[PDB]
Amino acid sequence: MYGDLGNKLVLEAKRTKQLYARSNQDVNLPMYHEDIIRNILKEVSNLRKNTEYLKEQQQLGMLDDKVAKCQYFVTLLCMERNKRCLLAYQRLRTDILDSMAWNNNGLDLMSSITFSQQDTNNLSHQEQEYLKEYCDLITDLKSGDLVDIDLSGSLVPPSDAFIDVRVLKDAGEIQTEYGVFNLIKDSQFFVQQSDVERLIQQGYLQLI
Partner 1 sequence: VSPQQDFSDLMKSWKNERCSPELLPYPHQLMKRLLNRISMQSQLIENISMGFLDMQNESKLPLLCMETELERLKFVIRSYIRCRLSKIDKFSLYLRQLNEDENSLISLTDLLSKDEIKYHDTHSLIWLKLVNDSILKYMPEELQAINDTEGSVNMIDEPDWNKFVFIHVNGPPDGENEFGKPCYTVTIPDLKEEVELTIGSIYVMRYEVIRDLLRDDKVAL
Partner 2 sequence: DDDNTEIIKSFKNFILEFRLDSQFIYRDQLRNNILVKNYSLTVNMEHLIGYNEDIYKKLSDEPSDIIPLFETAITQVAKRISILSRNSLPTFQLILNSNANQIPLRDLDSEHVSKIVRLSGIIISTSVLSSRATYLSIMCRNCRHTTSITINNFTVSLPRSCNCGPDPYIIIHESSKFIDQQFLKLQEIPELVPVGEMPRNLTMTCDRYLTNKVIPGTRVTIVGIYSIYNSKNGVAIRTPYIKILGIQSDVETSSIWNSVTMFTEEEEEEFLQLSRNPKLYEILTNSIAPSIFGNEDIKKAIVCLLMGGSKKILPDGMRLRGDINVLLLGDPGTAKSQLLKFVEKVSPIAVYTSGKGSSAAGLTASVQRDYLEGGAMVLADGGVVCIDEFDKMRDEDRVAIHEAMEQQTISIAKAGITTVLNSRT
Partner 3 sequence: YYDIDDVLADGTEFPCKFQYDIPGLGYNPGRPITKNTKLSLPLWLARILAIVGPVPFVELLPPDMFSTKVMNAIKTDPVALDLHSINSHFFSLAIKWIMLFSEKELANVVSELLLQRAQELNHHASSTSTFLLKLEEMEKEIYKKSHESYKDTKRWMFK
Q: Binding residues for partner 2, per CB under 8 A?
A: 15, 18-19, 21-23, 28, 30-31
Nearer to partner 2, 31 or 109 (CB): 31
What part of residues 67-106 is at the interface with partner 3 (CB under 8 A)? 67, 70-71, 73-75, 77-78, 81, 84-85, 87-88, 91-92
Structure letter (DSSP) for residue 118: T
- Tell which one of 11, 31, 74, 149 touches partner 1 (CB under 8 A): 149
Least CB distance to partner 2 at residue 121 (A): 14
- Alpha-carbon distance of 13 to 5, in angstroms, equals 12
Distances (CA, A) of 12 to 4, 9, 26, 84, 182: 13, 5, 19, 15, 46
Least CB distance to partner 3 at residue 31 (A): 18
Q: Which among partner 3, partner 1, partner 2, none contacts residue 58 (Cβ within 5 to 8 A by kind)?
A: none
Whats the size of the chain, residue-wise?
208
Indicate the burial class of 181 (C-beta count within 10 angstroms; 0-12, 13-18, 19 or more): buried
